[PDB]
Every structure is written in C-alpha cells, then in structure tokens.
PDB file of C-alpha atoms and ligand atoms in Angstrom:
ATOM      1  CA  UNK A  25     118.787 162.601 155.356  1.00 48.20           C
ATOM      2  CA  UNK A  26     118.874 165.157 152.539  1.00 47.98           C
ATOM      3  CA  UNK A  27     117.884 165.128 148.882  1.00 50.06           C
ATOM      4  CA  UNK A  28     120.611 164.233 146.398  1.00 49.41           C
ATOM      5  CA  UNK A  29     122.200 167.377 145.002  1.00 47.46           C
ATOM      6  CA  UNK A  30     122.464 169.123 148.369  1.00 45.33           C
ATOM      7  CA  UNK A  31     125.820 170.888 148.684  1.00 45.64           C
ATOM      8  CA  UNK A  32     127.589 170.635 152.055  1.00 46.10           C
ATOM      9  CA  UNK A  33     130.819 172.164 153.342  1.00 47.05           C
ATOM     10  CA  UNK A  34     133.919 170.062 153.935  1.00 43.96           C
ATOM     11  CA  UNK A  35     136.262 170.693 156.862  1.00 41.72           C
ATOM     12  CA  UNK A  36     138.471 172.826 154.602  1.00 43.67           C
ATOM     13  CA  UNK A  37     135.629 174.981 153.260  1.00 45.06           C
ATOM     14  CA  UNK A  38     135.096 173.563 149.782  1.00 45.53           C
ATOM     15  CA  UNK A  39     131.784 172.040 148.719  1.00 45.55           C
ATOM     16  CA  UNK A  40     130.745 168.402 148.356  1.00 45.71           C
ATOM     17  CA  UNK A  41     127.563 166.757 147.130  1.00 47.89           C
ATOM     18  CA  UNK A  42     125.547 164.936 149.780  1.00 49.05           C
ATOM     19  CA  UNK A  43     125.471 161.829 147.565  1.00 48.90           C
ATOM     20  CA  UNK A  44     129.284 161.987 147.310  1.00 49.70           C
ATOM     21  CA  UNK A  45     129.880 161.897 151.079  1.00 52.04           C
ATOM     22  CA  UNK A  46     131.617 158.718 152.237  1.00 49.33           C
ATOM     23  CA  UNK A  47     132.492 157.145 155.570  1.00 49.85           C
ATOM     24  CA  UNK A  48     135.170 159.130 157.384  1.00 50.97           C
ATOM     25  CA  UNK A  49     134.752 162.277 155.275  1.00 50.22           C
ATOM     26  CA  UNK A  50     135.448 165.560 157.061  1.00 54.24           C
ATOM     27  CA  UNK A  51     132.505 167.974 157.111  1.00 56.54           C
ATOM     28  CA  UNK A  52     132.360 171.441 158.691  1.00 57.78           C
ATOM     29  CA  UNK A  53     130.559 172.047 161.970  1.00 59.65           C
ATOM     30  CA  UNK A  54     128.797 175.234 163.079  1.00 59.99           C
ATOM     31  CA  UNK A  55     131.659 176.137 165.453  1.00 60.10           C
ATOM     32  CA  UNK A  56     134.323 175.875 162.732  1.00 63.30           C
ATOM     33  CA  UNK A  57     135.882 172.591 163.842  1.00 66.35           C
ATOM     34  CA  UNK A  58     135.658 169.430 161.756  1.00 65.10           C
ATOM     35  CA  UNK A  59     133.088 166.619 161.790  1.00 68.77           C
ATOM     36  CA  UNK A  60     133.356 162.953 160.821  1.00 70.42           C
ATOM     37  CA  UNK A  61     130.604 161.363 158.734  1.00 71.92           C
ATOM     38  CA  UNK A  62     129.875 157.645 158.982  1.00 71.32           C
ATOM     39  CA  UNK A  63     127.170 155.012 158.462  1.00 70.38           C
ATOM     40  CA  UNK A  64     126.118 156.108 154.993  1.00 72.16           C
ATOM     41  CA  UNK A  65     122.491 155.345 154.102  1.00 71.68           C
ATOM     42  CA  UNK A  66     120.586 155.885 150.860  1.00 69.52           C
ATOM     43  CA  UNK A  67     117.015 155.601 149.698  1.00 70.10           C
ATOM     44  CA  UNK A  68     114.266 156.895 147.444  1.00 69.98           C
ATOM     45  CA  UNK A  69     110.967 158.345 148.645  1.00 69.96           C
ATOM     46  CA  UNK A  70     108.711 161.383 148.461  1.00 69.89           C
ATOM     47  CA  UNK A  71     110.513 164.145 150.349  1.00 68.12           C
ATOM     48  CA  UNK A  72     109.510 167.350 152.127  1.00 69.05           C
ATOM     49  CA  UNK A  73     110.454 170.702 150.579  1.00 72.51           C
ATOM     50  CA  UNK A  74     110.899 173.488 153.143  1.00 73.97           C
ATOM     51  CA  UNK A  75     110.781 176.974 151.621  1.00 73.98           C
ATOM     52  CA  UNK A  76     112.296 179.765 153.721  1.00 74.96           C
ATOM     53  CA  UNK A  77     113.049 183.364 152.831  1.00 71.62           C
ATOM     54  CA  UNK A  78     116.377 184.374 151.248  1.00 74.84           C
ATOM     55  CA  UNK A  79     117.921 180.904 151.438  1.00 70.04           C
ATOM     56  CA  UNK A  80     117.588 177.995 149.027  1.00 71.63           C
ATOM     57  CA  UNK A  81     114.891 175.416 149.746  1.00 74.61           C
ATOM     58  CA  UNK A  82     115.698 172.458 152.009  1.00 71.94           C
ATOM     59  CA  UNK A  83     114.511 169.071 150.720  1.00 73.43           C
ATOM     60  CA  UNK A  84     114.749 166.326 153.343  1.00 74.99           C
ATOM     61  CA  UNK A  85     113.003 163.213 154.643  1.00 74.33           C
ATOM     62  CA  UNK A  86     110.098 162.900 157.072  1.00 75.20           C
ATOM     63  CA  UNK A  87     112.378 161.763 159.920  1.00 73.83           C
ATOM     64  CA  UNK A  88     114.875 164.603 159.422  1.00 74.66           C
ATOM     65  CA  UNK A  89     115.635 166.646 162.545  1.00 71.41           C
ATOM     66  CA  UNK A  90     115.578 170.437 162.163  1.00 72.47           C
ATOM     67  CA  UNK A  91     117.674 172.666 164.437  1.00 73.24           C
ATOM     68  CA  UNK A  92     115.383 175.671 164.899  1.00 77.51           C
ATOM     69  CA  UNK A  93     114.991 178.712 167.133  1.00 75.26           C
ATOM     70  CA  UNK A  94     111.683 179.482 168.856  1.00 79.15           C
ATOM     71  CA  UNK A  95     110.482 182.833 170.171  1.00 80.47           C
ATOM     72  CA  UNK A  96     110.328 183.435 173.930  1.00 79.74           C
ATOM     73  CA  UNK A  97     115.349 186.163 173.361  1.00 81.33           C
ATOM     74  CA  UNK A  98     115.166 182.962 171.304  1.00 80.73           C
ATOM     75  CA  UNK A  99     115.442 179.367 172.523  1.00 81.96           C
ATOM     76  CA  UNK A 100     117.196 176.520 170.706  1.00 84.89           C
ATOM     77  CA  UNK A 101     114.908 173.594 169.819  1.00 83.29           C
ATOM     78  CA  UNK A 102     115.429 170.387 167.829  1.00 84.68           C
ATOM     79  CA  UNK A 103     112.219 169.144 166.195  1.00 84.25           C
ATOM     80  CA  UNK A 104     111.554 166.485 163.569  1.00 85.09           C
ATOM     81  CA  UNK A 105     110.051 167.295 160.173  1.00 84.20           C
ATOM     82  CA  UNK A 106     106.879 165.255 160.768  1.00 82.04           C
ATOM     83  CA  UNK A 107     105.939 166.956 164.041  1.00 81.50           C
ATOM     84  CA  UNK A 108     106.725 170.366 162.542  1.00 78.29           C
ATOM     85  CA  UNK A 109     104.412 169.532 159.630  1.00 81.10           C
ATOM     86  CA  UNK A 110     101.660 168.603 162.085  1.00 81.59           C
ATOM     87  CA  UNK A 111     102.019 171.860 164.051  1.00 80.87           C
ATOM     88  CA  UNK A 112      99.551 174.653 163.221  1.00 83.39           C
ATOM     89  CA  UNK A 113     100.726 177.610 161.169  1.00 83.09           C
ATOM     90  CA  UNK A 114     100.434 179.999 164.123  1.00 84.26           C
ATOM     91  CA  UNK A 115     102.986 177.785 165.883  1.00 84.65           C
ATOM     92  CA  UNK A 116     105.093 177.202 162.756  1.00 85.42           C
ATOM     93  CA  UNK A 117     105.606 180.963 162.391  1.00 85.97           C
ATOM     94  CA  UNK A 118     107.379 181.045 165.781  1.00 83.49           C
ATOM     95  CA  UNK A 119     110.264 178.814 164.618  1.00 84.74           C
ATOM     96  CA  UNK A 120     113.329 180.012 162.713  1.00 83.98           C
ATOM     97  CA  UNK A 121     116.173 178.340 160.872  1.00 82.98           C
ATOM     98  CA  UNK A 122     119.649 179.701 161.514  1.00 86.37           C
ATOM     99  CA  UNK A 123     123.013 179.973 159.771  1.00 87.02           C
ATOM    100  CA  UNK A 124     126.563 180.452 161.032  1.00 87.29           C
ATOM    101  CA  UNK A 125     128.476 183.576 159.997  1.00 88.92           C
ATOM    102  CA  UNK A 126     123.997 184.064 163.852  1.00 88.52           C
ATOM    103  CA  UNK A 127     121.353 185.020 161.284  1.00 93.48           C
ATOM    104  CA  UNK A 128     117.760 183.911 161.905  1.00 90.83           C
ATOM    105  CA  UNK A 129     115.506 182.918 159.006  1.00 94.21           C
ATOM    106  CA  UNK A 130     111.727 182.650 158.754  1.00 96.64           C
ATOM    107  CA  UNK A 131     110.251 179.255 157.868  1.00 96.11           C
ATOM    108  CA  UNK A 132     107.323 180.172 155.649  1.00 96.74           C
ATOM    109  CA  UNK A 133     106.241 177.031 153.799  1.00 92.79           C
ATOM    110  CA  UNK A 134     106.750 173.271 153.827  1.00 92.21           C
ATOM    111  CA  UNK A 135     105.069 170.801 151.476  1.00 93.39           C
ATOM    112  CA  UNK A 136     105.343 167.175 150.388  1.00 92.40           C
ATOM    113  CA  UNK A 137     106.845 166.579 146.948  1.00 94.03           C
ATOM    114  CA  UNK A 138     104.703 164.994 144.246  1.00 93.40           C
ATOM    115  CA  UNK A 139     107.150 162.400 142.917  1.00 94.17           C
ATOM    116  CA  UNK A 140     109.713 160.231 144.750  1.00 94.59           C
ATOM    117  CA  UNK A 141     113.344 161.312 144.910  1.00 91.10           C
ATOM    118  CA  UNK A 142     116.647 159.695 145.853  1.00 92.09           C
ATOM    119  CA  UNK A 143     118.102 160.789 149.193  1.00 91.16           C
ATOM    120  CA  UNK A 144     121.335 160.269 151.131  1.00 92.63           C
ATOM    121  CA  UNK A 145     122.039 160.469 154.853  1.00 93.76           C
ATOM    122  CA  UNK A 146     124.662 159.786 157.501  1.00 89.99           C
ATOM    123  CA  UNK A 147     125.550 160.504 161.128  1.00 88.25           C
ATOM    124  CA  UNK A 148     127.843 163.199 162.510  1.00 91.40           C
ATOM    125  CA  UNK A 149     130.018 163.129 165.631  1.00 96.48           C
ATOM    126  CA  UNK A 150     130.433 165.903 168.256  1.00 95.50           C
ATOM    127  CA  UNK A 151     127.228 168.018 168.449  1.00 96.37           C
ATOM    128  CA  UNK A 152     125.928 166.077 165.391  1.00 96.65           C
ATOM    129  CA  UNK A 153     125.619 169.371 163.482  1.00 98.09           C
ATOM    130  CA  UNK A 154     127.006 170.239 160.052  1.00 96.67           C
ATOM    131  CA  UNK A 155     126.857 173.127 157.591  1.00 97.68           C
ATOM    132  CA  UNK A 156     125.230 173.453 154.187  1.00 98.42           C
ATOM    133  CA  UNK A 157     126.937 175.297 151.333  1.00 97.81           C
ATOM    134  CA  UNK A 158     125.019 178.439 152.360  1.00 97.32           C
ATOM    135  CA  UNK A 159     126.172 177.907 155.991  1.00 98.22           C
ATOM    136  CA  UNK A 160     122.735 176.648 157.056  1.00 97.83           C
ATOM    137  CA  UNK A 161     123.053 174.566 160.224  1.00 96.66           C
ATOM    138  CA  UNK A 162     121.709 171.020 159.850  1.00 98.89           C
ATOM    139  CA  UNK A 163     121.212 168.118 162.270  1.00101.74           C
ATOM    140  CA  UNK A 164     121.374 164.337 161.815  1.00105.13           C
TER     141      UNK A 164
HETATM  142 PT1   PT B   2     118.291 161.908 158.249  1.00103.52          PT
HETATM  143 PT1   PT B   3     111.230 156.564 156.695  1.00106.36          PT
HETATM  144 PT1   PT B   4     120.162 167.501 168.674  1.00105.20          PT
END
C-alpha cells in the first residue's frame, strides 16, 4: 500500500503510476521476471514517510511490509512499518533498504504525515516482491 504518485516498473521496464495499476497488470520483480498484480484496494489516511539516503522518500501505510537487510554479512528480514516505527533508533540503524541492479541503503528517518493522503495497494504473485522506478525492492 503506497502513496498515490509512486512510480513502479512494468514487466517491460517502463514506468506506471501506483494509482494506475489494474488487475492483471504486469509489474517487474527483483529477479527480472514478471509479476501479476490483483485485488486492487484504495483508501485515504495519514501515511508514513520514510526518508533514506540517496533515494527518494517512500510514503506508505502503517501495515506496509518493508523488505530490509539487518546487520549480523547481512540477513534478509521482512518487517512491518508499525513495528519498525516502534523499534528504538539504535535498532533502526541496523536495518537497510535494498535495490536491484545489490546496493544497500541506510534508513535514517521515518515520520507520520500531518494530513491524510490517498493511497493504492494490491497483491503480487511469486515472491510477492516488485520494483519501484528507482529499482527499490518493495513487498506487499
Ligand atoms: Pt500494503
Ligand atoms: Pt489500516
Ligand atoms: Pt515476505
């Protein structure tokens, strides 16, 4: 569940708005093969803005699942946005976002937006992973 305006990659490589995704649309997975989106859902609520270095901010819902990497080389961990918000900063600094090109990115801030915002979401087959326009790996 991402904020409207988020740009995702189709199976061919071109971009598509998250609000423009429809049932059966072909997204791009982190391994290069295609993904099928289905069960489109929309809403409007106060979202969480995750600011990381280099890459554009990620605005998502409270129940959004983040595919992160944790130190101790690195281990792959899926964690929801709410639990990650509740973790202390000393623990938050151990988690990293990642993009497919295997670049690791520091998560350095995450705050709740002031005003509500429209959001769109869906489910993804296979490993349930898809790519953002900047190749950031995202989970259902
Ligand atoms: Pt979601
Ligand atoms: Pt909710
Ligand atoms: Pt997962």
